[PDB]
Amino acid sequence: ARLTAYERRKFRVRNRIKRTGRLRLSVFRSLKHIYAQIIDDEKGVTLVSASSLALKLKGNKTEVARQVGRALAEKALALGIKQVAFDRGPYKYHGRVKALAEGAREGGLEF
Amino acid sequence: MEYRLKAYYREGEKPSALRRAGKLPGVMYNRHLNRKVYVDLVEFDKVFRQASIHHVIVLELPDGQSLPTLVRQVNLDKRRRRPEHVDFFVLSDEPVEMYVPLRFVGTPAGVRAGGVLQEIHRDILVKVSPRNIPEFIEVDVSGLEIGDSLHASDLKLPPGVELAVSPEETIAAVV
Amino acid sequence: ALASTRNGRDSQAKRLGVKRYEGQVVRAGNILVRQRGTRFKPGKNVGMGRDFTLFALVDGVVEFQDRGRLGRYVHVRPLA
Amino acid sequence: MLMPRRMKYRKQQRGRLKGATKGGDYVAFGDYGLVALEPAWITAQQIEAARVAMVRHFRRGGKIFIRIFPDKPYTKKPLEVRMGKGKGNYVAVVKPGRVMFEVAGVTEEQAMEALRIAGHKLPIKTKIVRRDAYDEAQ
RNA sequence: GCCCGGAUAGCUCAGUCGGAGAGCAGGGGAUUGAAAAUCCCCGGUCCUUGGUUCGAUUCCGAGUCCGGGCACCA
RNA sequence: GCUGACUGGGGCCUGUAGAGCACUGAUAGGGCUAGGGGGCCCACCAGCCUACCAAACCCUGUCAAACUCCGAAGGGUCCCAGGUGGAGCCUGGGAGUGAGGGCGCGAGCGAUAACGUCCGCGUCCGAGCGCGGGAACAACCGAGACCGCCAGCUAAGGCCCCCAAGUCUGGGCUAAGUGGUAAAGGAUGUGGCGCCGCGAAGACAGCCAGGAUGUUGGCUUAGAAGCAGCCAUCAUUUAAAGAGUGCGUAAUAGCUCACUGGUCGAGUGGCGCCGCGCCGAAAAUGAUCGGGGCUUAAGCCCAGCGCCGAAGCUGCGGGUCUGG
RNA sequence: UCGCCUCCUAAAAGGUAACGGAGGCGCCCAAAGGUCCCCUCAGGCGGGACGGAAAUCCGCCGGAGAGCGCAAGGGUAGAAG
RNA sequence: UCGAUCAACGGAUAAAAGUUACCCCGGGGAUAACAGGCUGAUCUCCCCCGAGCGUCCACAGCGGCGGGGAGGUUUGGCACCUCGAUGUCGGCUCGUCGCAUCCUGGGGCUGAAGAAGGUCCCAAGGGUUGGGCUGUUCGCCCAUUAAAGCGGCACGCGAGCU
RNA sequence: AAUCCCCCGUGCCCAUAGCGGCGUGGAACCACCCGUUCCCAUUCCGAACACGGAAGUGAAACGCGCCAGCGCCGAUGGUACUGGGCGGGCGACCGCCUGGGAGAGUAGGUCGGUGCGGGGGA
Ligand SMILES: [Mg+2]
Ligand SMILES: [Mg+2]
Ligand SMILES: [Mg+2]
Ligand SMILES: [Mg+2]
Ligand SMILES: [Mg+2]
Ligand SMILES: [Mg+2]
Ligand SMILES: [Mg+2]
Ligand SMILES: [Mg+2]
Ligand SMILES: [Mg+2]
Ligand SMILES: [Mg+2]
Ligand SMILES: [Mg+2]
Ligand SMILES: [Mg+2]
Ligand SMILES: [Mg+2]
Ligand SMILES: [Mg+2]
Ligand SMILES: [Mg+2]
Ligand SMILES: [Mg+2]
Ligand SMILES: [Mg+2]
Ligand SMILES: [Mg+2]
Ligand SMILES: [Mg+2]
Ligand SMILES: [Mg+2]
Ligand SMILES: [Mg+2]
Ligand SMILES: [Mg+2]
Ligand SMILES: [Mg+2]
Ligand SMILES: [Mg+2]
Ligand SMILES: [Mg+2]
Ligand SMILES: [Mg+2]
Ligand SMILES: [Mg+2]
Ligand SMILES: [Mg+2]
Ligand SMILES: [Mg+2]
Ligand SMILES: [Mg+2]
Ligand SMILES: [Mg+2]
Ligand SMILES: [Mg+2]
Ligand SMILES: [Mg+2]
Ligand SMILES: [Mg+2]
Ligand SMILES: [Mg+2]
Ligand SMILES: [Mg+2]
Ligand SMILES: [Mg+2]
Ligand SMILES: [Mg+2]
Ligand SMILES: [Mg+2]
Ligand SMILES: [Mg+2]
Ligand SMILES: [Mg+2]
Ligand SMILES: [Mg+2]
Ligand SMILES: [Mg+2]
Ligand SMILES: [Mg+2]
Ligand SMILES: [Mg+2]
Ligand SMILES: [Mg+2]
Ligand SMILES: [Mg+2]
Ligand SMILES: [Mg+2]
Ligand SMILES: [Mg+2]
Ligand SMILES: [Mg+2]
Ligand SMILES: [Mg+2]
Ligand SMILES: [Mg+2]
Ligand SMILES: [Mg+2]
Ligand SMILES: [Mg+2]
Ligand SMILES: [Mg+2]
Ligand SMILES: [Mg+2]
Ligand SMILES: [Mg+2]
Ligand SMILES: [Mg+2]
Ligand SMILES: [Mg+2]
Ligand SMILES: [Mg+2]
Ligand SMILES: [Mg+2]
Ligand SMILES: [Mg+2]
Ligand SMILES: [Mg+2]
Ligand SMILES: [Mg+2]
Ligand SMILES: [Mg+2]
Ligand SMILES: [Mg+2]
Ligand SMILES: [Mg+2]
Ligand SMILES: [Mg+2]
Ligand SMILES: [Mg+2]
Ligand SMILES: [Mg+2]
Ligand SMILES: [Mg+2]
Ligand SMILES: [Mg+2]
Ligand SMILES: [Mg+2]
Ligand SMILES: [Mg+2]
Ligand SMILES: [Mg+2]
Ligand SMILES: [Mg+2]
Ligand SMILES: [Mg+2]
Ligand SMILES: [Mg+2]
Ligand SMILES: [Mg+2]
Ligand SMILES: [Mg+2]
Ligand SMILES: [Mg+2]
Ligand SMILES: [Mg+2]
Ligand SMILES: [Mg+2]
Ligand SMILES: [Mg+2]
Ligand SMILES: [Mg+2]
Ligand SMILES: [Mg+2]
Ligand SMILES: [Mg+2]
Ligand SMILES: [Mg+2]
Ligand SMILES: [Mg+2]
Ligand SMILES: [Mg+2]
Ligand SMILES: [Mg+2]
Ligand SMILES: [Mg+2]
Ligand SMILES: [Mg+2]
Ligand SMILES: [Mg+2]
Ligand SMILES: [Mg+2]
Ligand SMILES: [Mg+2]
Ligand SMILES: [Mg+2]
Ligand SMILES: [Mg+2]
Ligand SMILES: [Mg+2]
Ligand SMILES: [Mg+2]
């Protein structure tokens, strides 16, 4: 079975975002951690990084996430960055990933 | 049994001219070498009729070296059906694919007088360490009966080296 | 029918193709390619209309891009 | 007769006889060949006329390969004048250097004498050939 | 000359899955007092020739003895 | 008012020629195999062999405007340069044309017919039926005619005479008047290149010389006892003659060859290729390459040198318009 | 035969003819429309009651040969299904 | 926003079919019928190959399937001069030419005993009948004959006739 | 802090990165995993999606390697074709000059390369 539902859903949501042409606020979330990476395509480049992994914090993976989102805003807004669009990758906008997003205001936003 | 020809070199010298010159444009190569070369037609002809991409050809040419070549391609121009150019493949010690002619040995060997003979190949493609090159392969298999097909490894496979296969194909049969 | 002639039609040429090529100056709205399928996909600063028609979104120059199995792509480069 | 089953289109444009070449030409199945010197549309009925010349020539014996085939539909009008194309009415398009026919499993004098008869039934000049190193291995 | 048709035991004429028929003759039986009628049983180099096919009356191709249709001219 | 046709460079676009078979189809030979044509063992599932059908699949081998895994040369467009041209663009006034034709190339229709027809790209005639060549001839070759000249150089084509200039110079070809013509096909024409079989262990050609044994071969027969015929065509004796290749035929007598010795004495027979020629080759008023006439050429192929040759180019004079 | 669409002809830009070679339209859909979310085919082989070449189911292989209302073409699963 | 097979689909009117050999005018060789021309599918005649028939077989005589041509007499294709006119079938009269020869002359082969034939070659000098039928050409038929030839000449010939 | 190496994201080249085989990795990342109370789920199914987890395992998946059976890529040389210029053939068609020049095929290549960021080692 070639090219799984994961990587279709992946690609589908990604390309739609990439067309609007904002910077990309891209979300990886593993079983353990949740990472978030703000990217400018066409320079093929990451600008503002934020992990739970590098902020070494724990318990309630969601409340961890609102935090790595507030982490990104504070970090990012400091470079001038305000408007972006939310990548959300192959993940339902829900729970942990919704939480990192609604934590990614105080800066950033419309999300 | 052993064949040598001649050879020469070229850089410019439009092939059409050389070709009118009784000569035969060609090229010399292998993993290590590639070089423009011409030969004499009649000469090439007399040998290649025996040699025929089957037995090894030692060329010669100046330097003077003697280069141990297999002929891997011949282009005839289709109108006059006569060679317009030649690939000379030079051997060194690494295994090399090639076409070995086949000796069909026996009598009708079952359904004597007679089956229907039916040779489905004069050749086999086989990987061979150049050093030992099996200048034919006796295929006896006097079992040799109606409707049957020998495939591959049932061939003698003289000492040197293995098939370039496919291990399953058609050699001969009687029907 | 069969013989007398049952044939004899055809339809108007649709005058389809590329209407602006690489390194050619265009204005917002210029249409760059006229085409049947997605034969060229819209790139940077390039729209698609309902009939798959590619237009410049901005003034600029037009650059062509062959992304291999991703298709060919038409963008408009600004300094518009 | 000799003729396809299943055509995709009934009738097809004449086209050129140009650029004598392309495929066939190397004597792949048999002992001697008959090679085509000139271009022509050779007709399903000239082919059969050559075949039967040859099979008649040896004892129902020998083996024959043919190796050109009439897939090109040949139209003709009735003694009308001009409206529509058509009709009817098959050819193989044959350029120089092609081997048609090509016998095997017969003696040299036989093959060569059959092929010479076979050649008389054709609209073009021909050449009889034997077989070669040059006809390679493949 | 010109394009399309059909030969079949002894005469009549089926027989498009490619691997021989019933009638009506004639002989025989049953039936009857004997017959007629009716039912049972009895033998083609399948128009020559070349071809495809392992194999052709049954497919291809003409050519033939013989049936349908065709065109001198203003 | 420098942007024009054309040209140089750079980008992008394309799906034709060629080629390919991956697709859509078609398709030769073989292989291995579903379904069965059914030979039949069944008549229960069975069920094996296929020199018929046969998918797919592998091997070899091809074909296609409406097939394409590929794909040139070219073409188109933009940018930057060259390009001052009876170039370009803008506004406006006056039009005429809207029957085209031949040729070359690419296609379609036609019959791989038409001085056929329909498109494409070029050209020329149209309007250059003005000039030179092609015998003669709108459109093939040469060349764009402002006027004059009893001056020159050339083009195409020519230089034996008609007819201007070579009976020029060298080398080979052809003997048909080919040239001055039409194909398949043919042929010890003729000249060259080549490869192969046999040959001074004396081949080829003639000539001298052997001209089988059992035997009628068994078959078939009045008899075929090779030659009125269907064939077991087999054993032998030799340097060595096929139960016999032909004449013969009252079957036998008589005769010849095959195949052998020997005579003599240097080539012989086979094939392939290129050049020119030869046959194939019959039409209607009188013939002919334009004509005479041409044969180591006045024909054809190769190399050379000169010349002749237009209204083209030049030289001399002049006109008119445009620029300066 | 006459208008419209598709393919070839059409000579790799556009365009290009013939009583050239072949097909289709004169509708349709309140969902067959908009959006957000998810899902991924056809085929082949193996397995499974009634199920057979094909109803449904399970397994593996299957980059698109399926589907996209209808003709063809271009397109298309990184969706247009 | 509606009424259009205004489908001959840029749609003359709101509203429309035939016939003329009783015909007329303006035009056209822009275009048909005749002849010619180009062409040569078709037609007529050669030739190549040579299955096969011919007792056997060198094809004495045949010739399958295919192949290459010649001719320009047929039927056509095209639409080039001629529509300010190139009168058309046939007959008669008068011919003339071609030869792919019907007879006569000279030949070769024969499955030629002779005589008489068959086939092919040379040969265009001359000859090549009279009638019945039909407008006929052609063809059939009667009676003869050395023979009762095939074509071309605007399907020769109407300022020559009919 | 640079540099290298391993992992995790994520771009780019668009198969020389693919299939298949073999081998390898769990400390850390990652995955599978434990559970289904809660957010949220499944035209049935916590399979998927989702959440709260951390006992176990790298079996699957993924990552990293090594093999050329397939797949993919692919010369040089030669031809085909051809812009432009000339010939030849009754024709179908052929040839020469000059400039461009494939496709198939042969040789060979290939079991990927790389940017940004992070986590970890240098
Ligand atoms: Mg079109
Ligand atoms: Mg060929
Ligand atoms: Mg090939
Ligand atoms: Mg033909
Ligand atoms: Mg007409
Ligand atoms: Mg021939
Ligand atoms: Mg009684
Ligand atoms: Mg009784
Ligand atoms: Mg008449
Ligand atoms: Mg300028
Ligand atoms: Mg350019
Ligand atoms: Mg082609
Ligand atoms: Mg194919
Ligand atoms: Mg094509
Ligand atoms: Mg390539
Ligand atoms: Mg400029
Ligand atoms: Mg002007
Ligand atoms: Mg004006
Ligand atoms: Mg017009
Ligand atoms: Mg025109
Ligand atoms: Mg014309
Ligand atoms: Mg013409
Ligand atoms: Mg023109
Ligand atoms: Mg005029
Ligand atoms: Mg002019
Ligand atoms: Mg005149
Ligand atoms: Mg003149
Ligand atoms: Mg003149
Ligand atoms: Mg003159
Ligand atoms: Mg002139
Ligand atoms: Mg002038
Ligand atoms: Mg001269
Ligand atoms: Mg003269
Ligand atoms: Mg003189
Ligand atoms: Mg002289
Ligand atoms: Mg003469
Ligand atoms: Mg002459
Ligand atoms: Mg001389
Ligand atoms: Mg000269
Ligand atoms: Mg002079
Ligand atoms: Mg002056
Ligand atoms: Mg002026
Ligand atoms: Mg297409
Ligand atoms: Mg086009
Ligand atoms: Mg074009
Ligand atoms: Mg219709
Ligand atoms: Mg919806
Ligand atoms: Mg599936
Ligand atoms: Mg399935
Ligand atoms: Mg199943
Ligand atoms: Mg599809
Ligand atoms: Mg469709
Ligand atoms: Mg399509
Ligand atoms: Mg109208
Ligand atoms: Mg109209
Ligand atoms: Mg319109
Ligand atoms: Mg009205
Ligand atoms: Mg009346
Ligand atoms: Mg009156
Ligand atoms: Mg009146
Ligand atoms: Mg009038
Ligand atoms: Mg008439
Ligand atoms: Mg007349
Ligand atoms: Mg006429
Ligand atoms: Mg006239
Ligand atoms: Mg003719
Ligand atoms: Mg003729
Ligand atoms: Mg002849
Ligand atoms: Mg006529
Ligand atoms: Mg006219
Ligand atoms: Mg016309
Ligand atoms: Mg008139
Ligand atoms: Mg007059
Ligand atoms: Mg008059
Ligand atoms: Mg004569
Ligand atoms: Mg006589
Ligand atoms: Mg006589
Ligand atoms: Mg006599
Ligand atoms: Mg005689
Ligand atoms: Mg006479
Ligand atoms: Mg006379
Ligand atoms: Mg009377
Ligand atoms: Mg009559
Ligand atoms: Mg009479
Ligand atoms: Mg007369
Ligand atoms: Mg006439
Ligand atoms: Mg007359
Ligand atoms: Mg009169
Ligand atoms: Mg690829
Ligand atoms: Mg672990
Ligand atoms: Mg552990
Ligand atoms: Mg594992
Ligand atoms: Mg390649
Ligand atoms: Mg190359
Ligand atoms: Mg050229
Ligand atoms: Mg030419
Ligand atoms: Mg290549
Ligand atoms: Mg790999
Ligand atoms: Mg990376
Ligand atoms: Mg780091």
- The DSSP line for chain B is --B-------SSS-HHHHHHTTEEEEEEE-SS-EEEEEEEHHHHHHHHHHHTTTS-B----STT----EEEEEEEEETTTTEEEEEEEEEP-SS-EEEEEEEEE-SSS-SSTT-----BS-SEEEEEE-TTS--S-EEE--TT--TT----STTS---TT--B---SS---B---
Q: Considering only CA atoms, which of A80, A81, A51 is closest in space to residue A68? A: A51
DSSP letter assigned to residue D28: -
Q: Chain C residue with minimal CA distance to D88?
A: C3
Cα three-residue angle A38-A39-A42, rounded to 5 degrees? 165
Pair D89, D76: CB distance under 8 Å? yes
Give the gap in angstroms from C-alpha B87 to the nearest C-alpha of chain D: 13
**CB neighbours of A18 closer than 8 A, spacing ≥ 6?**
A24, A41
Q: Is the dihedral of CA A88, A89, A93, A96 positive or negative?
A: negative
What amino acid occupies position B161? V
Residues in chain D closer than 8 A to B123 (CB atoms):
137
Q: How many CB pairs under 8 A join C and D?
A: 7
Query: Structure tokens of B122?
Result: 């004069």
Cα B58 to Cα B64: distance, rounded to the nearest angstrom: 12
- Alpha-carbon dihedral B157, B163, B167, B171, rounded to 10 degrees: -60
Q: Is the dihedral of CA B83, B84, B90, B91 positive or negative?
A: negative
Q: Is the CB of A41 under 7 A from strand I?
A: yes
Cα B7 to Cα B159: distance, rounded to the nearest angstrom: 32
Query: Structure tokens of C77?
Result: 């480069």
Resolution in A: 3.0
Cα D114 to Cα D60: distance, rounded to the nearest angstrom: 12
Query: Structure tokens of A67?
Result: 């935090």
Pair A65, A52: CB distance under 8 Å? yes
Query: Structure tokens of B68?
Result: 């141990």
Q: B79 and D137: CB-CB below 8 Å?
A: no
Positions on chain G within 7 A of a protein C-beta: 1-2, 4-10, 13-16, 19-24, 37-41, 61-64, 73-80
Residue A57: alpha-carbon gap to chain centroid:
18
Q: Is C3 on the interface with D (CB under 8 A)?
A: yes
Tell me how far CA of residue B96 lies from CA of A30, B55, B56, D127, in angstroms: 52, 14, 12, 38
Nucleotide in closest CA–C1' contact with C7: G22
How many residues make up chain D in this entry?
Answer: 138
Q: Chain B residue with minimal CA distance to D27?
A: B81
Neighbours of D49 (CB within 10 A): 15
Residues in chain B closer than 8 A to D25 (CB atoms):
76, 78, 81
Domains in chain D and their CATH numbers? 29-134 (3.90.1170.10)
Nucleotide in closest CA–C1' contact with D52: E51
**Phi-psi category of residue D6: left, alpha or beta, with phi > 0 → left and psi -120 to 50 → alpha:** left
Cα D19 to Cα D17: distance, rounded to the nearest angstrom: 7
Q: Considering only CA atoms, which of B66, B30, B57 is closest in space to residue B133? A: B57
Pair B156, B138: CB distance under 8 Å? yes
List of chains touching C (3+ CB pairs within 8 A): D
Q: Kindly tell me the burial class for residue B62, based on how many C-beta atoms sit within 10 Å of its own C-beta (0-12, 13-18, 19 or more).
A: exposed
Nucleotide in closest CA–C1' contact with D47: H66
The owner of tokens 């280069």 is B67
- What angle in degrees, to the nearest 10, is found between the helix axes of A95-102 and A61-77? 30
Pair C30, C53: CB distance under 8 Å? no
Pairing mode of beta strands D40-43, D91-94: antiparallel
What amino acid occupies position C19? K
How many residues make up chain C in this entry?
Answer: 80
Query: Structure tokens of A19?
Result: 């067309």
CA of D24 to C1' of F69 (A): 21
The dihedrals phi and psi of B56, each to the nearest 5 degrees, come to -60, 140
Nucleotide in closest CA–C1' contact with D64: F29
Q: B78 and D21: CB-CB below 8 Å?
A: yes
List of chains touching A (3+ CB pairs within 8 A): none
**CB neighbours of A87 closer than 8 A, spacing ≥ 6?**
A13, A14, A17, A24, A25, A26, A27
Pair B55, B3: CB distance under 8 Å? yes
Query: Structure tokens of C78?
Result: 């600004």
Query: Structure tokens of C11?
Result: 């339809």
The owner of tokens 């609007």 is A20
Pair D36, D97: CB distance under 8 Å? yes
Pair A89, A27: CB distance under 8 Å? yes
How many angstroms is it from B87 CA to the middle of ligand 98? 29
Residues in chain C closer than 8 A to D87 (CB atoms):
3
Residues in chain C closer than 8 A to D83 (CB atoms):
4-5
